[PDB]
Amino acid sequence: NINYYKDSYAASATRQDFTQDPKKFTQPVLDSIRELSAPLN
Amino acid sequence: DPVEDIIHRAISSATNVESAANTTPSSHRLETGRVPALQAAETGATSNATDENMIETRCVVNRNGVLETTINHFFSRSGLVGVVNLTDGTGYATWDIDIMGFVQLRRKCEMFTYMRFNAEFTFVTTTENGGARPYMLQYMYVPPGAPKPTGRDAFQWQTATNPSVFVKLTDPPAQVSVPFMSPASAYQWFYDGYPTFGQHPETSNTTYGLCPNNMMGTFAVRVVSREASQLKLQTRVYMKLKHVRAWVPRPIRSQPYLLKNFPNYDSSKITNSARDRSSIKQAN
Amino acid sequence: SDRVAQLTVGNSSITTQEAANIVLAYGEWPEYCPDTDATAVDKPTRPDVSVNRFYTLDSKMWQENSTGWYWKFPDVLNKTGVFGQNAQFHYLYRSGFCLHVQCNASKFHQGALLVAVIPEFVIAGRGSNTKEAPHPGFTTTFPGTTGATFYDPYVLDSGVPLSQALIYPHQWINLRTNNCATVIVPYINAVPFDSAINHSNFGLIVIPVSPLKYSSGATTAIPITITIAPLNSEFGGLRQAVS
Amino acid sequence: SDRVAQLTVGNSSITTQEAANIVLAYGEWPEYCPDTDATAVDKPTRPDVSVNRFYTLDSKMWQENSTGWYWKFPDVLNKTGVFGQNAQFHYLYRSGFCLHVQCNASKFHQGALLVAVIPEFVIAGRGSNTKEAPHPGFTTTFPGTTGATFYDPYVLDSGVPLSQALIYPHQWINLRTNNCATVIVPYINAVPFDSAINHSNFGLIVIPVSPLKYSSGATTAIPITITIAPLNSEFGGLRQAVS
Ligand SMILES: CCCCCCCCCCCCC/C=C/[C@H](O)[C@H](N)CO
Numbered sequence: 001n002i003n004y005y006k007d008s009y010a011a012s013a014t015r016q017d018f019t020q021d022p023k024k025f026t027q028p029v030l031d032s033i034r035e036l037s038a039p040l041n
Numbered sequence: 042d043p044v045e046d047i048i049h050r051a052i053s054s055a056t057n058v059e060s061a062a063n064t065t066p067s068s069h070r071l072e073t074g075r076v077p078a079l080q081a082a083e084t085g086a087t088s089n090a091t092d093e094n095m096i097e098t099r100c101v102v103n104r105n106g107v108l109e110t111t112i113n114h115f116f117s118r119s120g121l122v123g124v125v126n127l128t129d130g131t132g133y134a135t136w137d138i139d140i141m142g143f144v145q146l147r148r149k150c151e152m153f154t155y156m157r158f159n160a161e162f163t164f165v166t167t168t169e170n171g172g173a174r175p176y177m178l179q180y181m182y183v184p185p186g187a188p189k190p191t192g193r194d195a196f197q198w199q200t201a202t203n204p205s206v207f208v209k210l211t212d213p214p215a216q217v218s219v220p221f222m223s224p225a226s227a228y229q230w231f232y233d234g235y236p237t238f239g240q241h242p243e244t245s246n247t248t249y250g251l252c253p254n255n256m257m258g259t260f261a262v263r264v265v266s267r268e269a270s271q272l273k274l275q276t277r278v279y280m281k282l283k284h285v286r287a288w289v290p291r292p293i294r295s296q297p298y299l300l301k302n303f304p305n306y307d308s309s310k311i312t313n314s315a316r317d318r319s320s321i322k323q324a325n
Numbered sequence: 326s327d328r329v330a331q332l333t334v335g336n337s338s339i340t341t342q343e344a345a346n347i348v349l350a351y352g353e354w355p356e357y358c359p360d361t362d363a364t365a366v367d368k369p370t371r372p373d374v375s376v377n378r379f380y381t382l383d384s385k386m387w388q389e390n391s392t393g394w395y396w397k398f399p400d401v402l403n404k405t406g407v408f409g410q411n412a413q414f415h416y417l418y419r420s421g422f423c424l425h426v427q428c429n430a431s432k433f434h435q436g437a438l439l440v441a442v443i444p445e446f447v448i449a450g451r452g453s454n455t456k457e458a459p460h461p462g463f464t465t466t467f468p469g470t471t472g473a474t475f476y477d478p479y480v481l482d483s484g485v486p487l488s489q490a491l492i493y494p495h496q497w498i499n500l501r502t503n504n505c506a507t508v509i510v511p512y513i514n515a516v517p518f519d520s521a522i523n524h525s526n527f528g529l530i531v532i533p534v535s536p537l538k539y540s541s542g543a544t545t546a547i548p549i550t551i552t553i554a555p556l557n558s559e560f561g562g563l564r565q566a567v568s
Numbered sequence: 569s570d571r572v573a574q575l576t577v578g579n580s581s582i583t584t585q586e587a588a589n590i591v592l593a594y595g596e597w598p599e600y601c602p603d604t605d606a607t608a609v610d611k612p613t614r615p616d617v618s619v620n621r622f623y624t625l626d627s628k629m630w631q632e633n634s635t636g637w638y639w640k641f642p643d644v645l646n647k648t649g650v651f652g653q654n655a656q657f658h659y660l661y662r663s664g665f666c667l668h669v670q671c672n673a674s675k676f677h678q679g680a681l682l683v684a685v686i687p688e689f690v691i692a693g694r695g696s697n698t699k700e701a702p703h704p705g706f707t708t709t710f711p712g713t714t715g716a717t718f719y720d721p722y723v724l725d726s727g728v729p730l731s732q733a734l735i736y737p738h739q740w741i742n743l744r745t746n747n748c749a750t751v752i753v754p755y756i757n758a759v760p761f762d763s764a765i766n767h768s769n770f771g772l773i774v775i776p777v778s779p780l781k782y783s784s785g786a787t788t789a790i791p792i793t794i795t796i797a798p799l800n801s802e803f804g805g806l807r808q809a810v811s
Contacts, residue, residue: 009159009220013283017111021055024352025290027086028052028494031327031346035089038572039081040345040502041327052352069620070581071666071752073573073590078583083497084346085508096579097617154445155515227515231445233397233466234524238567243462250447254515289351289444289513292489296480299455306484307453308477314486 064101067093112287119163119281120146125262130271132193133263135183137256140280141230141301148294155227158285160219166210166276173211174272176264180206180215183259190261198263207265225254227288231304250303332425332507334554335378339425345503350442350494350510355421355557362517365417369559376408376558379425382470384548385531387428387436393475393532395446395482397525398422398553401470403568408555416562418521423554424508424529430500430547436537438549439487439530440506441495444513446528449483451476467525478532487532509556518561522568529553575668575750577797578621582668588746593685593737593753598664598800605760608660612802619651619801622668625713627791628774630671630679636718636775638689638725640768641665641796644713646811651798659805661764666797667751667772673743673790679780681792682730682773683749684738687756689771692726694719710768721775730775752799761804765811772796 003011033039077094092098108114122140127133141147150156168174181197182204183189190197208215232252235241241248260278264270295314299305318325330347332339357371380402385394399420402408412418426440448466452459465473475482481490496506514526529551537547573590575582600614623645628637642663645651655661669683691709695702708716718725724733739749757769772794780790 007218007220009284010218013113013117016108017113018057018059019055020058021053024051024053025492027089028349028352029084029086029346030349032052033084033086033089033346035077035091035094036075038076038079039084039086050354052349069578070574070576071590073587074569076572076574076583078574078581079572079585081345081502083499083502085348085494085496085506086346095576095581097576225515229445229515231447232524233445233447233526233528236523238523241463241467243464245457245460246463246466247460249460249466290492291443292485292492294484295486296484299453300458303458303460304447304449304484305452305454305458306449306480308451309453311477311480314488 058107061103061105061107063103064098065093066100067096067098069097070094112285113283116149116158116282116285119161119279121277122146122280123260123278125260125276125278127262127264127274127276129264129274130269132269133190133261135189135262136260136278138258138260139256139301144298146280147298151230151294152290153287154231154289154291155229156282156285156287157221157227158282159221161216161281161283162219163214163216163279163281164206164208164276165214165279166274168210169273169275175209175211176266176270176272177207177209178274179263179265180208180276181261183261185256185258187258189259190263193263193269194267222257223254228255230255231291332379332423334423334556335374337379337554339379339552341427341505343429343504344507345496345505347507347509348494348496350508351513353511355509355511357557357559358419358517364517365561367561369417369419369561370411370415370563371559372407372411373558376406376411377555378406379423379552379554380405380408381550381552384550385472387438387533387537387547387549389537391474391533391537393478393530394472394549395468395475395528395530396470396472396551397446397467397528399521399555400467400525401553402555403521405470408558411558411560412521413566413568414563415560416520416564417518418558418560419512419518420558421512421556422510423556424506424510425552425554426498426506426529426531426549427504427552428498428500428547428549429504430537431543432501433543434500434537434539434547435535436500436533437535438498438506439490439495439532439534440498440508441490441493441530442508442510442527443481443490443493443530444527446530447483451482475532481530487534575622575666577666577799578617580622580797582622582795584670584748586672586747587750588739588748590750590752591737591739593751594756596754598752598754600800600802601662601760607760608804610804612660612662612804613654613658613806614802615650615654616801619649619654620798621649622666622795622797623648623651624793624795627793628715630681630776630780630790630792632780634717634776634780636721636773637715637792638711638718638771638773639713639715639794640689640710640771642764642798643710643768644796645798646764648713651801654801654803655764656809656811657806658803659763659807660761661801661803662755662761663801664755664799665753666799667749667753668795668797669741669749669772669774669792670747670795671741671743671790671792672747673780674786675744676786677743677780677782677790678778679743679776680778681741681749682733682738682775682777683741683751684733684736684773685751685753685770686724686733686736686773687770689773690726694725718775724773730777 077090080088121143125134125136188197206215236251296306330341330344403412448461450459494508573587646655691704693702737751
């Protein structure tokens, strides 16, 4: 968490991201489907 | 009172996930109407059948790490992007900064369409027999539009405005940081378009796919001396992607590579993605 | 209540009775450019009825030995309608789309299509040269309303395999389940506005994975029609016409 | 919401999309033996995953002139899996079952099966002797996994007519309506525990009442598979192996 320059891009790697959001790639549909039901009815 | 019709969200939700997912215990299902095994792949969605609804599972408190798989820890590993050959006795050498020429780091970067990163270059300069001779070098950075040097002792090496690095061969290798220098808001590796207007030809249009938002300049190198010393050099440039953001994933390359700027392949020799076996009805 | 749908945009409407679902590309809706992301200093035009409507292209006959097809968007609509006239008088361009591929077949036919949307779909050349080198013609890269057939659909004509091409927004047209695929796509580009003549953003692709088979006596002519529609389209930089 | 079902027991699961309903035999669920009805003084073993799962038997081809079939339970599972090893090391035995008979056919086929469950199904001999007398062989009474075809399905090979055999727990497999029959059976015996080698409790029976008919050109091979599963099984009296 240290930097010796005033330029913010000369620093090391920043804090960890820890998030992911897979619902935009796995299930990108309008009618949200459940698990325990038939997807086509 | 006036004309009325002049008066007249998303789906995904990100969660901070630390470790891998757990498993809750299950039981047996003996009932009709509720089925988790039947899917429909035509809806464009993936299957959502979890393993608690297929079999009977136990309670597992999972403590595995999902840290090294992020896009920062995946790209912050410096690899070779260019080799500059300098034979002294024109006296200098240039290198158009294009990292699409070496294939270890190219294929990692072709997973995505748009990337926004900072870089961290490193220049490992040796002789042709191994290195370590006490001569002094100069590495200029020539932005697009700046005059490239035209001689071993020309006036463009005065370097009053653009950056430069003086380092000997016997020092540790020089290392700088480079910001996001594109005029757009992301480096795009695939540009389906033409740079200029006009009538585009049918035979050989060498401008299809040229993205001028990625051309970042020229890297020049000489030996800081008056009389021409006689020693052959090679530099090796190592780029480390840091502070990196990526958009719009795409499939990974499966065909062998051909040109730097163009995604060519040969159609007469298309390599299959899966190596062959004897028949379909046996596994080994 | 899920197989029946109607899509009214502008003065046009599409009904369907054997649909599957509707896919939003990457979970987002097409919208106008906000003020915190705009870089031009002129006021844009927003026609909003005359350019946001379902344009129906021509039909592609699907046969036994079809190797597949691709269009470029917004290349196919630069010469049709008032969208084709606003995209020539104006230098800048921004829109979304709403795609719909119709293909019906009886209860005795079989096969499957892959209808996907590929952002920045760059066509590759087909030579074993390491520099001169072969490059695709202008009617191959920017085909227009007549599309273009693939030469090598296994690698999508870009050295990139079809088996992983389900990472893009897509649906399937399985002839025993549905007859239509609908994909709604936002504006995906690295700049807020860009030209509609040089740069085509993405490319619709329909490739038959499992081939069309039918017993003798059935109807032999199975066409594939494609009906597309811009959404939230706006233009800028008025000048004279350049096609 | 009634034609679609899934049955997950153990590590195995059965899906169906054209079912009818699920029948509990005599309105009761298989359970463990209570302490007020137990007569042994040892502790029983209850594996509960390794023995409660769907075992799939072999397939029976159904033809024009089939006179029908019968298995004995738990005879068919004394040699398959860990249920077949717990039923040999242990003298005592108690379980329920969950049966499932799959038989699919197209929209141009016709016929009907009768899938019933007969407690204490005793095979009769076929002679006009009043004492010597004919008695059925051991592979006819206790057939195993390969079953046995009826000789006289009209009297169920026991002098007892089929027309009244709907008093047992049963379903129908009518090829225009469904394709599978499911019967869940508790433990029905006069003693709390009994041996699994000498005494088979009940017998599953599949008899085609209306015959299989199909027009020319259709698929001629219609198989009948049977997938059964023990439920709430427990054993007692450990000793050496007797088959
Ligand atoms: C004395 C320091 C000289 C070295 C400084 C180099 C700065 C220029 C680096 C710009 C950022 C990386 C260049 C762009 C990346 C890819 O090669 C291009 N996008 C090619 O498509």
